[PDB]
A paper describes a structure:
Nucleases of the S1/P1 family have important applications in biotechnology and molecular biology. We have performed structural analyses of SmNuc1 nuclease from Stenotrophomonas maltophilia, including RNA cleavage product binding and mutagenesis in a newly discovered flexible Arg74‐motif, involved in substrate binding and product release and likely contributing to the high catalytic rate. The activity of SmNuc1 towards c‐di‐GMP in crystal resulted in a distinguished complex with the emerging product 5′‐GMP. This enzyme from an opportunistic pathogen relies on specific architecture enabling high performance under broad conditions, attractive for biotechnologies.
Author numbering: 27 to 277
Write the structure that this text describes.
């Protein structure tokens, strides 16, 4: 996603944290002036201008392009060296949960987890390798040139003309999505990537013309918006498991 999609996933999630995860997220965020779950959500996309070294190391962590293999993930083939979103999200979840690490290490892992749960729910981050997740599919959208990747990351969301305060309650108004019965941080990333890939491959998502407009928006923007809500609910369920699961009896 672009920055608004990432923030909206975080804002949906933030309100769904259990008290244990609420306290721990807030404690990690408090170590960085002005940080909120929403404000850190775009951070991993900004690393060219914030941390170039980490930016180079983590560029491939935003994607897993499995569509040519019918959306059936295989880590050795699709994720050599762990360099894809499935394995990155698993590892960063482990790091985030490791209370023996420094607050700085765990806050960095939180930034990645918040961002990557968003990206792994973006269909065009789990699509074809050969066209760079739809980036090479250039099209006219209304009167403007774009590409299929950008259309899904931000172009359709932008048609609402809403800031986050207007968009958030619209996402919250949707019918509740069906989640996994319990979060498994090591297994769910593959499930989510495969589901996102199947959307990339659904009828008409790749359009039959290179001039699209309101008919495309009206059919597919609801699906993009459903994926934001789903991503936010899944992010809260994951943070509740990773940061909200300690067996505690102190008053
Ligand atoms: Zn993104
Ligand atoms: Zn993207
Ligand atoms: Zn990203």
């Amino acid at each position: 996603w672009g920055a608004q999609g990432h923030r909206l996933v975080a804002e949906v999630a933030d309100a769904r944290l259990n008290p244990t995860a609420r306290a721990e997220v807030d404690r990690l965020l408090a170590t960085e002036p002005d940080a909120t779950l929403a404000s850190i959500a775009p951070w991993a996309d900004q690393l060219r201008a914030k941390d170039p070294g980490l930016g180079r190391r983590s560029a491939g962590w935003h994607y897993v392009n499995i569509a040519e293999d019918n959306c059936h993930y295989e880590a050795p083939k699709h994720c050599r060296n762990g360099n894809c979103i499935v394995e990155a999200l698993k590892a960063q979840s482990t790091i985030l949960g490791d209370r023996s690490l420094t607050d700085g290490e765990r806050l960095q892992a939180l930034k990645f987890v918040v961002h990557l749960v968003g990206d792994i729910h973006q269909p065009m981050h789990a699509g074809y390798a050969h066209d760079k997740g739809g980036n090479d599919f250039q099209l006219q959208f209304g009167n403007r040139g774009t590409n299929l990747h950008s259309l899904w990351d931000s172009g359709m969301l932008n048609t609402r003309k809403l800031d986050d305060a207007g968009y958030l309650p619209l996402l919250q108004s949707q019918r509740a999505p069906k989640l996994a019965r319990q979060s498994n941080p090591q297994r769910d990333p593959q499930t989510w990537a495969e589901a996102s890939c199947r959307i990339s491959m659904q009828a008409g998502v790749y359009p039959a013309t290179r001039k699209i407009g309101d008919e495309y928006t009206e059919r597919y923007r609801p699906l993009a918006e459903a994926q934001l809500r789903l991503a936010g609910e899944n992010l809260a369920q994951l943070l509740n498991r990773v940061l909200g699961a300690r067996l505690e009896h102190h008053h």
